[PDB]
């Protein structure tokens, strides 16, 4: 089908520019448009701009001066590069693809590119276990789960046993500690009778840091 | 550009009950709106297109209408997937801009939560530092307290709360209390305990333990 | 409301 696939998040200091790329598979950058909105705290849902099937752009106008989208028809690939950032230019950036080649109806979207404006440094987080015990177990229910603890800048994706368990997961909005680092846990609840037959291992990736871990979480 | 503006910022609706989005342009734009959900970490996803026209693959209970400037998005017999917010979006006048978004919340009956509490590990240990959760699982509504004691003395301002988004099945919620202080301080103390306050509750859970036993 | 990076969702 048609998809969009952007490159993935991370921090880029003040004054500096930002630089996502857009891949598309299920259709072709001759027939369509491809735009870019994003979505912050401060202006929610704006849209930037677009590059149209052969080659036009048009901005928004506050972002003609520090915008430029550029694409490689024969790589499927669009280029979004925004200039001079500030704080406020925090936002999930995203790139879409409308019904029809000339309309605005957004029927595409890219699994949005989370940026932060900041002029701290990368931090990849250390992952604790939160263990299983007689403290975490009613009713023949277990609860066990992660410390995802002091990493910047957001996000953190957390799954379970490589994909294989999502059904009782909550993985928990992230808080900024004094620090200025982030802090999240992600726990999940299991039949205390499987623990001892089934591993548990919540998968841990801080794509902004390429800080990929696996943390195996056991009875203490 | 053109100003819309959607109402009321919060609706809160029971399951199978009917619910209306209101969004109002700055100026007559026709029928060129379009609507979007957004779900928890989701990007957004197209409902409406032209104030009433369907999109393939959404369930039917989504419709829209009006014109002008004065426009509705509906859903017949609303589900816990619609867990959601709802934007609409003018195309009449360049540039398209979006409208700030409703939020729609799923009332449910009362749900006690579950409660769980998680010592330092003794990896975290080995770095100075010492995190105590206390895990509420799958309640409603999502008012709760959580009181923490260390040797009975009261615990203030060194926790940090965080609360998932409503199940998009069961309607619940679940919250996080973290507990962080230092390794000394951790060491120089015996009984931890969080106690958890909930309409739910017919009195106050508390969850303890002894650093050892 | 407002719009929250971590979540994707409003929080008013």
């Known amino acids: 089908q048609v998809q969009l696939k952007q490159s993935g998040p991370g921090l880029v200091q003040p004054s500096q520019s930002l630089s996502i790329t857009c891949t598309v598979s299920?259709?072709?950058?001759?027939?369509?448009?491809v735009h870019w909105v994003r979505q912050s705290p401060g202006k929610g849902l704006e849209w930037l701009g677009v590059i149209w099937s052969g080659g036009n752009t048009d901005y928004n106008t506050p972002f003609t001066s520090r915008l430029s989208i550029n694409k490689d028809n024969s790589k499927s690939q669009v280029f979004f590069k925004m200039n001079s950032l500030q704080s406020n230019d925090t936002a999930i950036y995203y790139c879409?693809?409308?019904?029809?080649?000339?309309?605005?109806?957004?029927?595409?979207w890219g699994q949005g590119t989370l940026v932060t404006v900041s002029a701290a440094s990368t931090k990849g987080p250390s992952v604790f276990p939160l263990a299983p015990s007689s403290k975490s177990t009613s009713g023949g229910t277990a609860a066990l789960g992660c410390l995802v603890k002091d990493y910047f800048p957001e996000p953190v994706t957390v799954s379970w046993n490589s994909g294989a368990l999502t059904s009782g997961v909550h993985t928990f909005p992230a808080v900024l500690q004094s620090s200025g680092l982030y802090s999240l846990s992600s726990v999940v609840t299991v039949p205390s009778s499987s623990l001892g037959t089934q591993t548990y291992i919540c998968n841990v990736n801080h794509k902004p840091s390429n800080t990929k871990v696996d943390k195996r979480v056991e009875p203490k | 550009d053109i100003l819309l503006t959607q109402s009321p910022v919060i609706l809160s609706v029971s399951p199978g009950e009917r619910v209306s989005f209101s969004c109002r342009a700055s100026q007559s734009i026709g029928t060129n709106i379009h609507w979007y959900q957004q779900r928890t970490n989701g990007s957004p996803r197209l409902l409406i297109k032209?104030?009433?026209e369907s999109i393939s693959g959404i369930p039917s209970r989504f419709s829209g209408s009006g014109s002008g400037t004065d426009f509705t998005l509906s859903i017949n017999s609303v589900e816990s997937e619609d867990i959601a917010d709802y934007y609409c979006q003018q195309n009449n006048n360049w540039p398209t801009t979006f409208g700030a978004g409703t939020k729609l919340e799923l009332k449910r009956t009362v749900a006690a939560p579950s409660v769980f509490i998680f010592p330092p590990s003794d990896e975290q240990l080995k770095s100075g530092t010492a995190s105590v959760v206390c895990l509420l699982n799958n309640f409603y509504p999502r008012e709760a307290k959580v009181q923490w004691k260390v040797d009975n003395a009261l615990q203030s301002g060194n926790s940090q709360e965080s609360v998932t988004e409503q199940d998009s099945k069961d309607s619940t919620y679940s919250l996080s209390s973290t507990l962080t202080l230092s390794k000394a301080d951790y060491e120089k103390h015996k009984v931890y305990a969080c106690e958890v306050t909930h309409q739910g509750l017919s009195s106050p859970v508390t969850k303890s333990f002894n650093r050892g036993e | 409301c407002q719009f929250d990076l971590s979540t994707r969702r409003l929080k008013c």
């Open positions: 879409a693809r409308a019904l029809t080649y000339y309309d605005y109806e957004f029927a595409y």
């Open positions: 299920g259709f072709s950058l001759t027939n369509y448009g």
């Open positions: 032209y104030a009433s």
